[PDB]
Amino acid sequence: YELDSIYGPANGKLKLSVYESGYQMRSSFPSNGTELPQYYYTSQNSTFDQAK
Amino acid sequence: RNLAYTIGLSRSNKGVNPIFPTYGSEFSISAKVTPPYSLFNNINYGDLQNQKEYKTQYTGTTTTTGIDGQAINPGDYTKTETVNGQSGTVSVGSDYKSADTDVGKVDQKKYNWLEYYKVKFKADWYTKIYGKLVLRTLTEFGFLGAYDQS
Amino acid sequence: CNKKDDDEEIVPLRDYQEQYNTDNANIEEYLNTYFITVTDAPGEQTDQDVTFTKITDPSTQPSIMSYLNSPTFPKLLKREVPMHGIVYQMYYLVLREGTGTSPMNTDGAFTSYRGEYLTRVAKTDTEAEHLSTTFFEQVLFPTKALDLYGTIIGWSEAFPQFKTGTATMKPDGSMKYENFGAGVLFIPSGLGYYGSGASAIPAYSPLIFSIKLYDLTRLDHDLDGVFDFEEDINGDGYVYDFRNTTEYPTPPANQYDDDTDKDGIADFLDSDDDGDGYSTLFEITKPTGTEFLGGLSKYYPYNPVSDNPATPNYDETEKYGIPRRPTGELTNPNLPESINNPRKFIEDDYLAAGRKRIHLDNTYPYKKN
Ligand SMILES: CCCCCCCCCCCCCCCCCCCC(=O)O[C@H](COC(=O)CCCCCCCCCCCCCC)COP(=O)(O)OCCN
Ligand SMILES: CCCCCCCCCCCCCCCCCCCC(=O)O[C@H](COC(=O)CCCCCCCCCCCCCC)COP(=O)(O)OCCN
Ligand SMILES: [Ca+2]
Ligand SMILES: [Ca+2]
Ligand SMILES: [Ca+2]
Ligand SMILES: [Ca+2]
Ligand SMILES: [Ca+2]
Ligand SMILES: [Ca+2]
Ligand SMILES: [Ca+2]
């Protein structure tokens, strides 16, 4: 097999760390009479990294 | 309803076997005609679409809502409008001039009594060219029309 | 074999009156022989959990029935629910009353509940007859609001008697709820699942639900732009539709209460809402070029609204509500008020208190020519 959708040098190596998240995630949340959707942004790395 | 009279003149001298004729010819002329109702009845088939009786109307007796979200009172004329993707009828009020013409009613009045004329002409000729070989020439014509173009 | 017979023997359908009497007796016996203990965790998820235990020391054990129409919480109340021809009576205990609004019988409720079903066990040779409560479902952490319109009749009748509470999100993503309504509702089999028995709950089994109303979500079932809580003609707080012969064999005398047009369709489920022909959505739609927009929405709200801080990318400020009949000056002093010369809106038509909104008045939109 040949890996697909790999961006960068083929000899690249990275330090992978798999942690247990300590931040509860929800798909939606009730508001002032309405059920708004929950959105997670690309700049929230600090929030998930601190609550590990 | 269709009431027509047809008269046809034919001349055939072919022979001898009807399956494989070797000589003769067959000429036929036909004409089917219907009474010219348009001449006697004083009805304008061209202005039918511009009359109140041939415009779309709401025959119900309960106030309803059209595709536009407005009231459609009983007896008011209607028109077809396409709001967003779907399409539906929209009340136009008493302005029948702006309503949609009822094609079904116009066609019904136009074709309540069939009025037309049909003419058919056919010519068939058989002849022996060489030995048992025979040549057949066939020419057919057909015309359908109306007394009033309107 | 090849034939397909249709022999449905679920025709029994135990009499509504007989089943209700049996369930009521079982529920009453449970309320007299059992007592409840309630936790008191202030901010934990077990803030108002209830534990039912048999009464073996009636000297100092106040039974659930002891909490009758008491003037102090906990209070056990009775709500008359007329349905199925008979008059159902549902017992519900209010351990604590919330410090917020109350949801309608057809609104969405964000709550955590633990349900159990009551089933009288036959007296065995060595064990005497008694009542047992078996657990069937529980939701400790609510995620989505439950529409009370589609839930059992018991929920839609008891929930409007409770209130919501405040909710705060902790730094770790968890949510902390406080000052919320909590209580246990004893719903008979008729108002719950009557004869279904498909789920773990056996057929004709009274249900006991321990609810904790965290929040509520206003819903609109007719999509007319007016929410169900605002389409309640009376101040009862309940909206009913009597178009179901199974639930209402004969329309009661209280009909037409939440129906302005008297067409049989309640306003919360009707689009016209007044019989004038013009839909409610069109009537509340902001006309083009009006001098009283007051917001970014294309539909006039029932009452003035304010922005939502929870929504920082949208301003919900709507300073104008659904207007009443125009009480301004005519386009032309001559001629009578009609479609040709319409009356202009002053300003107070969108803010007066007690005004007849054009969506409930069948004479404003004007006749078409
Ligand atoms: C197209 C539709 C309209 C068709 C109308 C049909 C008219 C009917 C005619 C009836 C016959 C005429 C009445 C008198 C008959 C006695 C014979 C004397 C008439 C005559 O002088 O002509 C004879 C033959 O032509 C005749 O007898 C007349 C010929 C008639 C026309 C022939 C064509 C008819 C239409 C068919 C053609 C299309 C094909 C479809 C079938 C020749 O007599 P003679 O040898 O002594 O000479 C005459 C010199 N003395
Ligand atoms: C135009 C169509 C729309 C309008 C409708 C037209 C209606 C036409 C008139 C109705 C037809 C009946 C009248 C003619 C037939 C009577 C003849 C009797 C029989 C007969 O023996 O024929 C002899 C001549 O025939 C003849 O009469 C020969 C001519 C017959 C054919 C002429 C009719 C038109 C043919 C074309 C049709 C297709 C049209 C295409 C556009 C007359 O002999 P006798 O009885 O005196 O005895 C003496 C010897 N037996
Ligand atoms: Ca509504
Ligand atoms: Ca009501
Ligand atoms: Ca109605
Ligand atoms: Ca409505
Ligand atoms: Ca209306
Ligand atoms: Ca906002
Ligand atoms: Ca109206």
* Cα–Cα distance for residue pair C124/C126, rounded to 1 Å: 6
Resolution in A: 2.7
A12 by DSSP, 3-state: which? Answer: coil
Q: How far is the CA of C260 from the centre of ligand 5 (A)?
A: 6
> Cβ of B68 and C282 within 8 Å?
yes
Atom of ligand 2 nearest to the CA of B33: 3
> Cβ of C143 and A28 within 8 Å?
yes
Which chain A residue has the Cα nearest residue C174?
A: A24
**Close Cβ partners of C297 (under 8 Å, ≥ 6 residues apart):** C286, C318
Counts of helices then strands in chain C (DSSP H, E): 3, 11
Q: Are B18 and B26 in contact (CB under 8 A)?
A: no
Partners of B82 in beta bridges: B87
> Cβ of C369 and B95 within 8 Å?
yes
For ligand 1, residues with CB inside 6 Å are B 9-11, 27, 29
**Is the Cβ atom of B9 under 6 angstroms away from ligand 2?**
yes
User: Exposure of C329 by Cβ count < 10 A (0-12 exposed, 13-18 middle, 19+ buried)?
Assistant: exposed
* Cα–Cα distance for residue pair C360/C148, rounded to 1 Å: 25
Question: Whose atoms come closest to the Cα of B120: which ligand?
Answer: 2
Which of C172, C217, C227 lies closest to A22 in CB terms? C172
Partners of C168 in beta bridges: C176
Token pair listed for C49? 């959990």
> Cβ of B70 and C282 within 8 Å?
yes
Residues of C in contact with A23 (CB under 8 A): 172-173
* Cα–Cα distance for residue pair B30/B117, rounded to 1 Å: 10
Which of C366, C309, C320 lies closest to C346 in space, CA to CA?
C320
Q: Are B70 and B42 in contact (CB under 8 A)?
A: no
C117 by DSSP, 3-state: which? Answer: strand
Interface test with C, best of B58, B67, B68, B70 (most C CBs within 10 A): B70
Q: Are C104 and C195 in contact (CB under 8 A)?
A: no
C348 by DSSP, 3-state: which? Answer: helix
* Cα–Cα distance for residue pair B24/B10, rounded to 1 Å: 13
Q: Is the link from the previous residue into C74 a cis peptide, with omega within 30 of 0? A: yes
Helix ranges, chain C (H): 16-33, 153-158, 280-284
- Kindly report the protein residue whose alpha carbon is nearest to atom 41 of ligand 2: B31
Interface test with B, best of C278, C284, C286 (most B CBs within 10 A): C278
**Residue B143 exposure: Cα atoms within 13 Å on the Cβ side:** 10
Atom of ligand 1 nearest to the CA of B29: 40
Which chain C residue has the Cα nearest residue A21?
A: C172
Q: Which residue has the tokens 């949510």?
A: C175
Phi-psi region of C289 (alpha: psi -120 to 50; beta: other; left: phi over 0): left
B residues 104-143 closer than 8 Å to C (CB): none
Token pair listed for C245? 């012969």
* Cα–Cα distance for residue pair C190/C87, rounded to 1 Å: 11
Subunits with 3+ Cβ pairs within 8 Å of B are C
**Close Cβ partners of C89 (under 8 Å, ≥ 6 residues apart):** C24, C78, C79, C80, C81
Elucidation method:
cryo-EM
Q: Are C210 and C114 in contact (CB under 8 A)?
A: yes
C270 by DSSP, 3-state: which? Answer: coil
* Cα–Cα distance for residue pair C181/C204, rounded to 1 Å: 28
* Cα–Cα distance for residue pair C255/C261, rounded to 1 Å: 12
Partners of C50 in beta bridges: C38
* Cα–Cα distance for residue pair C337/C346, rounded to 1 Å: 15
Partners of C89 in beta bridges: C80
C residues 272-311 closer than 8 Å to B (CB): 272, 275-279, 281-282, 285
User: Exposure of C119 by Cβ count < 10 A (0-12 exposed, 13-18 middle, 19+ buried)?
Assistant: middle
Which of B95, B103, B62, B61 lies closest to B78 in space, CA to CA?
B95
Helix ranges, C274-350 (H): 280-284
A50 by DSSP, 3-state: which? Answer: helix
Segments of C74-195 assigned E as strands: 75-82, 87-96, 108-121, 130-139, 146-147, 166-169, 175-178, 181-187
Query: Measured in whole angstroms, how far is the alpha carbon of residue C365 from the centre of its chain?
Result: 32
Which of C145, C144, C116, C121 lies closest to C131 in space, CA to CA?
C121
Q: Is C167 on the interface with A (CB under 8 A)?
A: yes
Flag whether B touches A (3+ CB pairs, 8 A cutoff).
Answer: no
* Planar angle of CA B30, B33, B34, nearest 5 degrees: 160
Q: Is the link from the previous residue into C121 a cis peptide, with omega within 30 of 0? A: no
Q: Are C302 and C322 in contact (CB under 8 A)?
A: yes
Query: Measured in whole angstroms, how far is the alpha carbon of residue C209 from the centre of its chain?
Result: 16
Q: Is A42 on the interface with C (CB under 8 A)?
A: no
> Cβ of A32 and C144 within 8 Å?
no
Query: What is the full DSSP assignment across B8-61?
Result: EEEEE--EE-SSSEEE-EEEEEEEEE---HHHHS---SSSGGGSGGGB-B---S
Token pair listed for C171? 């730094």
Phi-psi region of C22 (alpha: psi -120 to 50; beta: other; left: phi over 0): alpha
Other CB atoms within a 10 A radius of the CB of residue C165 amount to 21
Query: What is the full DSSP assignment across C22-79?
Result: HHHHHHHHHHHHEEEEE---SSSTTTT-EEEEE-S-TTT---GGGSSS-SSSSEEEEE
* Cα–Cα distance for residue pair B110/B150, rounded to 1 Å: 9
Residues shown for chain C? 369
Subunits with 3+ Cβ pairs within 8 Å of C are A, B
* Cα–Cα distance for residue pair C177/C199, rounded to 1 Å: 31
**Residue C128 exposure: Cα atoms within 13 Å on the Cβ side:** 0
Q: Is A34 on the interface with C (CB under 8 A)?
A: yes
C267 secondary structure, DSSP code: G
